[PDB]
Amino acid sequence: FLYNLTTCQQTCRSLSEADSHCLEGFAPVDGCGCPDHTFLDEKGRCVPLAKCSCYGLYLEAGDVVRCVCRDGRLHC
Amino acid sequence: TCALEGGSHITTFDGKTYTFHGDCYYVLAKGDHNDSYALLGELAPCGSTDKQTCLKTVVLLADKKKNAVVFKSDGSVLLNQLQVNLPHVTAS
Amino acid sequence: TCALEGGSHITTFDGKTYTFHGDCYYVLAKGDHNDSYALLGELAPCGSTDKQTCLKTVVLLADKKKNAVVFKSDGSVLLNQLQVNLPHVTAS
Numbered sequence: 452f453l454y455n456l457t458t459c460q461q462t463c464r465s466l467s468e469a470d471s472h473c474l475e476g477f478a479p480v481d482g483c484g485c486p487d488h489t490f491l492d493e494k495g496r497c498v499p500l501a502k503c504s505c506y507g508l509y510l511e512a513g514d515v516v517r518c519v520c521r522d523g524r525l526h527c
Numbered sequence: 528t529c530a531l532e533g534g535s536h537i538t539t540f541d542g543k544t545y546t547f548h549g550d551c552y553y554v555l556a557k558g559d560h561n562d563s564y565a566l567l568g569e570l571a572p573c574g575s576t577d578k579q580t581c582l583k584t585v586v587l588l589a590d591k592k593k594n595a596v597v598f599k600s601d602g603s604v605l606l607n608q609l610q611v612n613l614p615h616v617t618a619s
Numbered sequence: 620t621c622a623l624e625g626g627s628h629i630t631t632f633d634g635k636t637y638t639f640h641g642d643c644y645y646v647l648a649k650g651d652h653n654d655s656y657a658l659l660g661e662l663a664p665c666g667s668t669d670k671q672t673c674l675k676t677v678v679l680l681a682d683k684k685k686n687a688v689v690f691k692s693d694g695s696v697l698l699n700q701l702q703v704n705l706p707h708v709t710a711s
């Protein structure tokens with residue numbers, strides 16, 4: 452349970468855009484969320500940053516395009 | 528009516544059927560003014576050789592080119608990299 | 620910031636808190652020019668008497684008043700009488 456939940460604490464799919472939908476100017480709200488690290492996965496619990504996802508469909512952390520799926524960003 | 532049938536058989540608006548076999552995104556139709564629309568389409572190889580091509584993705588850039596609509600080849604219509612539910616009726 | 624808290628406690632943009640207890644759709648804010656936007660809101664009785672009112676539906680009429688967005692009191696955001704999936708990012 453948090454007291455400072457904001458829009459831009461979202462999944463790694465939000466990190467794929469990272470400048471398209473953040474929408475600063477609102478107020479923080481209180482709900483269920485993840486701590487200072489371990490961003491939210493595609494479904495369920497929030498795994499740490501290394502094996503988050505690679506978002507197209509959100510692929511798992513074992514896929515190679517040549518872009519190996521990595522922590523947040525892609526080596527493209 | 529312009530048609531894109533098979534993997535590679537373009538029939539233009541004025542007759543004129545031809546075969547292409549590409550590998551890229553291609554501009555299929557776009558409005559000339561500054562904005563109006565643009566219809567893209569991926570014609571990439573799907574089989575073994577380069578002469579076995581297929582249509583894979585239709586991209587529509589509408590409403591002063593600020594809305595991108597993507598038609599993947601499994602259903603999966605998605606507006607601005609986000610899944611939508613069908614039907615989806617808007618103003619334009 | 621204009622706030623609509625409780626069932627019936629309006630705080631205007633300039634201070635000025637007041638209590639109303641309505642039963643209708645009411646115009647909460649709208650642009651004066653000809654079009655710009657209009658924000659509605661239902662303040663209907665939810666309890667037993669007429670003095671037990673609640674907010675029930677927020678209606679937004681945006682993009683030259685051709686797009687209607689409805690915020691029901693169970694989630695259920697719906698654009699032009701059709702369910703949408705969230706997030707939903709557009710041009711305007």
Ligand SMILES: *[C@@H]1O[C@H](CO)[C@@H](O)[C@H](O)[C@H]1NC(C)=O
Pocket residue numbers: 455460486487
């Ligand atoms: C919310 O506040 C806590 C302090 O306990 C800290 O995790 C951080 O400042 C905030 N969390 C965020 C922004 O995720």
